[PDB]
Amino acid sequence: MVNPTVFFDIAVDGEPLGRVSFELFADKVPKTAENFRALSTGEKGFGYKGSCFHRIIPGFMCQGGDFTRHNGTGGKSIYGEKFEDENFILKHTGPGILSMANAGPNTNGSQFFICTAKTEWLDGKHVVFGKVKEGMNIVEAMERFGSRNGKTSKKITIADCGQLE
């Protein structure tokens, strides 16, 4: 069975930048993948549509998914509060990897990050659950609006998102 695809349309201060699409490894992290997918379609009554990438660090990663507080301190899963770290089967192999952000062990919410480089020190600490499929060049574009402390020089938002088919 083929893995789900989702898309984000990214804007930079209201201006469309482009689209990023992701394959979600429902086959290897089924629960973590379904959370991100459901959050992307908004099908549970809430989700990523309209939220921001609040922390972007060049040559490191782009983090977003805090749709309730817009700065890293909020978010929630479709399972309630927070959910457990499902496995560390997939590794931070390189750029385009999509991984759950977390507060501690088994504190997975709605927050996620997209690698812009290999991030092996996170192998075993963050649950990898997908990868960029199209538009890695758009993440690279996003990346130039970050800084060493992550604060972004312009506002980066998910203008729209959903499931491709």
List the helices and strands and how they pair.
Layout: E1 5-12, E2 15-24, H1 30-41, E3 53-57, E4 61-64, E5 97-100, E6 112-115, E7 128-134, H2 136-143, E8 156-163
Antiparallel strand pairs: 1-2, 1-8, 2-7, 3-4, 4-6, 5-6, 5-7
PDB class: isomerase
Keywords: ligand complex, beta barrel, prolyl CIS/trans isomerase, cytosolic, isomerase
Assembly: monomeric
The radius of gyration over CA amounts to 14 Å
Element order, helices and strands?
EEHEEEEEHE
Q: How do the strands line up in the largest sheet?
A: 3-4-6-5-7-2-1-8
| Secondary-structure content class | alpha+beta
Number of domains: 1
Give the termini distance in whole angstroms. 14 Å
Helical residue percent band: 10-25%
Largest sheet: 8 strands, antiparallel
CATH superfamily: Cyclophilin-like
Number of E-type strands:
8
Report the CATH architecture. Answer: Beta Barrel
Strand content: 25-35%
Would you give the CATH topology?
Answer: Cyclophilin
Pfam family, one: Pro_isomerase
Subcellular location: Cytoplasm; Secreted; Nucleus
Cross-link (Glycyl lysine isopeptide (Lys-Gly) (interchain with G-Cter in SUMO2)): 28, 82
Modified residues (Phosphothreonine): 93
